[PDB]
From a paper:
Retinoschisin, an octameric retinal-specific protein, is essential for retinal architecture with mutations causing X-linked retinoschisis (XLRS), a monogenic form of macular degeneration. Retinoschisin, a 24kDa protein secreted by photoreceptors, consists of a retinoschisin (Rs1) domain and a discoidin domain with a small C-terminal extension. Uniquely, the cysteine rich Rs1 domain and the C-terminal extension in retinoschisin mediate the formation of a C59-C223 disulfide linkage which is essential for octamerisation. Retinoschisin forms a dimer of octamers with each octameric ring adopting a planar propeller structure.
Author numbering:
A (entry chain H), B (entry chain A), C (entry chain B), D (entry chain G), E (entry chain F), F (entry chain E), ...: 63 to 219
The structure:
């Protein structure tokens, strides 16, 4: 809800089982690989954000929350050193974990698509007034500058 | 109601008995044929949507819900590869399952008819503010481009 | 009331005793004759609507409801094949079934009369905001094009 | 909340364990050093405010409150004798004491940064209407005139 | 609060221990000296108001109330015979009696200072809408015409 | 309060002990003298109002009510035969009967003074919206035409 | 109160003791004389209204009601045959029956006086919004055309 | 233009060559037949208006004016004795006398059609604000009650 | 300009050299073929509109006017018998006859495209307020129902 | 000015001397190279737009107009096949051809930078209301997706 | 005036006699020294802006224009590499070249002072609506970060 | 008039005959004494403003302008080192040089008096919208802090 | 007219023949007596204003102007030492010098009378917007405090 109560990615206490991906870094497994080791809210180190090797168009990233909550809004950031940013994407939400739905608003009578940002210092937010009763959220970035890299930060009620 | 709580067609758990039609694909039966096998909310495969062979003007498609609910609004999509879209249609609603009524609004003092869409990327919605206490809903498309094909998605309260 | 809860004429379960008229088709009786056999909400067949032989000016049609309810609004349609429509009429309402009253509004400081429609596709409604606590309703059409024929559809609260 | 109920730094009863820093004045310890001895709300003496020797860009100052409260607003002052003031900074807030978050508002669709002040007599406040449910607050001053020196004063609900 | 319920200085029943000062008139003590003997709301006699010998810039005057109350507003007067008035001052408020805070408003984004008055007949009030939950109040007059002399009159809720 | 419930001076049942003055008519006493004998709300006789011999500037007139009430508003009249009216005055109110306070409003940022009237037929009222929780009320007329004479009439809630 | 619930003068059941006057018609008594015998709300007969012989300026007419009620408003009429009407008057109200008060409004900052009427057919009313908690009401007509004659009609809540 | 300056059909001075039709009454000619003999603005006689024998759908009636003028608005009437009125029609205008154009407005984003009237006493006008620079005007009535009969009356600027 | 002064296609006096196309009907030439023989504003006959054989996406149709004029607005129609309508198109304009420009509006901050119509009876106009100083105009229909067929009608100032 | 009168790049009549660049394609010269041969308003062929080999940050492109005119607004497009678009740029204008100025608006109290577009179909315009009296205009694109490619189109008054 | 017509410092054609200063770089003279050699609107080289050695508080810089013009507005920039910016200053204007006046606005009822900027990328302008008929303009910067350095740019009408 | 065109006191070219006073500094004369030698718009030196020895209440200072002009507005300043400011004064204006008039405004229905200032840095102006057609202007300061000292600056049209 | 152009009474150049009165001071004449010798706009001396011996109710004072002008507005003052002021008066104006008219406004639907003032310091003006084309003006003061004394000051256009 319209409040300042974001999630806790910088804490790191969350197990890597929730952050599921498909980018084996050292053929260790298939569940996770990058997890929250080098992709947190402002974390100094080698990897400032989550990088991507293969140019996968239908990219996804599971985000398992603690329970079902009303998510509204999401921050936007970039990547230091090598500037990287997205251009087009779409939010998703599910419940039974056996489908994939696209986020559509009421004031969009055309093929409008979310923007995002274009600078690491910019903080172009997207206030989602329509309450969304869901839990899992994913992003389908259709384009990017060089590589997908953004320090996401969902907002819970 | 004005919320984001659509049905679950992509799940596929619903039995094909609810999705009744009259288009025998391989003379298997008369109840259903295409069902939700190749007609869901974004499903990659051979059949991206529900096709139609015979040019049936008075087309219908039973949609049996779980129970009586207040339906308001409906999404609009197209078909990939071969672009297809409707032009005119009319929503229906019943209760005793022994009649067929047409959807008429209060701010329509003429022979106005719903539009729909004209592009797979477009998402021209139709916010139906007037609450409709019903369960079964059908569509009577009077025209089309080449063949009837649209990934419908009702909205429940 | 301002809602979408019309009556059920297409069902046909209602007995013909309620739909009383005075047009013996085959000298069978005097109570009813045409009833809801060829006059329902969109019913394919020979008689698309209720026809009239004699040019009766003071025409009436009893409509016995289930119980006393607040009626507000009424749909308007025409007749296929042979276009037919009314021009002037007046709504009535009673209680003790031993009188006949005319419908008069508050914002009518003259001899104004309801219109109706002039096309089978048109749906010129008449939103009657003033609540009317009654049960039986009749119409007194003073004119017509060739023959009285309209698929009425009262609205209950 | 929008009220006049600031903290109590001038009292001095608070122990130096809360005011943690990293500026050993006489190699006494590492926890605190300057504490509230020469940095209070208007305190006559040698040190009118908290000075800084090394030009540390990522400066921080722990402020442990009594309990979790809704902080909103903050005063701004300068330094006597030698005029000193900041130019850019960012408010932070945490809960589990194992992360660091940046303060972002809803009406900031760009890389906007808080100002502060530029005179010891000026009192340019920053009314933070959005409630912030937190406890620990820190500042990340990115620039200054000569040395970081400001008599801060948080506001609790 | 916005009401007409001022304190009772003209009564004189209050003991001189509350009105603390530092102006020995006849080296009698250090606690009080002038008290409410020649400084009340319109009191005919020798001393029409409270005079000041030494030109003390950081002047103070303790005002111990009965209990903690919401003070809002304060009257302004002058001195007869020899016209005297202030120019700049600042209201203060404390609780633990071990600090001194300055009064700052929300609609003051600069180094604004209260005015006061400039005539014994004038009654330029200062409606302080923001509730102030305090008890002890003092004034820090930075300037004056010849000598500090004003018949103050706090307003309690 | 804003109502029509004035006091009862014309009744005369009130004892003269309440109406205290200092104008011995026949050296009878010092408490009262004129009382409500020749000064009431429209009373035909010799003395149409309360006259004054000595030109006393700091004139007062005790008005002891039944109990503490919220007084708001006051009528204004003149004197027949010999026209007399005031020009400047000030309302007062007390509680402990051991002080004297002046009436000051919130919308008076100057040395404004009440007017009154200037004709026996005129009825220039002064609606005092700010509630005044008091009991005793007095007037300090600073000027007059020839002699102080006015048929006052307080208003109680 | 603003309603249509006038008194009952036309009934005549009220005893003549309430309608007190001072106009002996046949030296019968001093209490009443004309009473409601020839002065009611539209009463055909000899005396259409209440006449007056002597040109009494300070005219009065006691009107004893059943109990204390909130009176608001009063009708105005004339006299048939010989047209008669007033020009100036004043309403009065009392409680203890031992005084006489004049009716003064809040929006009258001058010597304004009520009008009344100037035609038997006219019905110039005077909506008295300010509630008046009283019982006895009288009129002090200061002028007239030839003789005082008006069919009054108080309004009770 | 918005003024009261209609044409002169009742005068009859205009020759029948302008009023061209195709309804030989007595096989006299082909140019005109009924002309303005029994079709004028209120003309008592046998033919109250212009009748029509054959049920011609694409009916036309040439109206040659004196010169090119700005026509705006048109009256609407009926027929006495036997009530007759139209239902749908369309205005036309040309210049070179070698084409036929239909009248379309700017605020008609659908298949709207002009109404007309439905009573000889009614005078439902159609204020055509958009100036129309033309001369010849015709009507294409698509429907009627029994026979086409209306006393038209163009309006010139 | 916002007026009713369309072109003259129904006249037919224009030579076929202006209406240039590339659809040889009987290998007669390459300049024109269909011209205004079976494509005019409502012309009864075999060809009700201009048909198209090959499914040419980048379709064009030269329209040489008399001189340079300010064109604003354009009508929209359909085709009888076999219903046909467009879906997407774009207006063009040139001057030197050696280029091709696309029509872009000021209130279109996206990839918006003109609609057109979807019924022969509908008249969905497109009021082009922005003046366009040009002469030649063409259309680039990107889609259609079955075949391109529309009775265009430009509007000149 | 706010009108539809763009330049003429598609004509090609302009000599290559005006379009100056610094990208020798075949070491032919230093003045121009790509010119308007493969970079015009929608020109089918090999090069759909102007490509760039070296990743030059301070890119420039001289645009010599016919004379000094008031330029306002500019279109935005993309590149087919390989999608390419800019992210940040700045407009410039000069007069004496011996300097370079940056375009700054009045409603930009920060480091705001123009956007542009992000799709070949999009037409995100930038209405520059402030008149700019200049002739030569250049762009300083600071970023891009892969290569600088955009079909610019200035707007003259 | 509110237009885009700045001066021409980047041209360099202006002689150094106009840009008078008092900072001998190599004891060459006293008139000028730095001039427009290393202080222009964006000029790549060693000196990006005008530096200052001595910490002169009452700094001045003569700016002789071509003639008397109405100056309104002024741009604000910073310095690359080493960030430098001002904090307080005051605009001046003269005519006879024998005095120095300070710039005071009408909506400044206090000791307000202009700000400027605090970033090389920021462009915080100061729209001076009040016309100023003058020629010579100077700045009196009272403070700075390290050294005075700003690429000024006056605006002429 | 509302413009920035003050007089020229800093120039000093004006002869001392215009600045007439009555404060012989060294018994040199009676016309002038201090003149514009140590009283100009910001002039560094011994006397920062015009001082006053004797406490003259009815102080005056002739200001002979070049000719009759419309004066509107006046600046307000203080004195450095020793802070001095006025409290009450009144503007005057004459024509025949044989009288003295006081400045009275239209929106002053009381004994209001101009304020001035109370700080050398403050610039509390007094916009005099009412045009004043005069030439000579003087001030009658009724009070001051210690000595009359203010750097006046009239404003001419 | 609404401007600052009063008459010139302080000059004294006007002859005493214009200021006609009827108060022989030393039986010198009958025309004038007090004239402008001791009654001017602020004139120090014995007589601060014009006194009156006999209590003349119908007082008059001729004021012969230079010519006919539009008079609007008039100042109001008092008398020093002995405070004196009026209460009621009426302005007059004539032309042929053979009559006397009273000043009546349009927004006075009652017996309203001008007030004036009640303090020498007050300046209660009376803006007379209605233009008055006259020359001679007089005042008819009906009341006063002790003696008629006021320093009048007419306002000419």
């Amino acid at each position: 809800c319209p409040y300042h109560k974001p999630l806790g990615f910088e804490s790191g206490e969350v197990t890597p089982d929730q952050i599921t991906c498909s980018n084996p870094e050292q053929y260790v497994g298939w569940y996770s690989s990058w997890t929250a080791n080098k992709a947190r809210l402002n974390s100094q180190g080698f990897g400032c954000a989550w990088l991507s090797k293969f140019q996968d168009s239908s990219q996804w990233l599971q985000i398992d929350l603690k329970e079902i909550k009303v998510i509204s809004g999401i921050l936007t950031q970039g990547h230091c050193d090598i500037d990287e940013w997205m251009t087009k994407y779409s939010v998703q939400y599910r419940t039974d974990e056996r489908l994939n739905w696209i986020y559509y608003k009421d004031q969009t009578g055309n093929n409008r698509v979310f923007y995002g940002n274009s600078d690491r210092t910019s903080t172009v937010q997207n206030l989602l007034r329509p309450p969304i009763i869901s839990r899992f959220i994913r992003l389908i970035p259709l384009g990017w500058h060089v590589r997908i890299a953004i320090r996401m930060e969902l907002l819970e009620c």
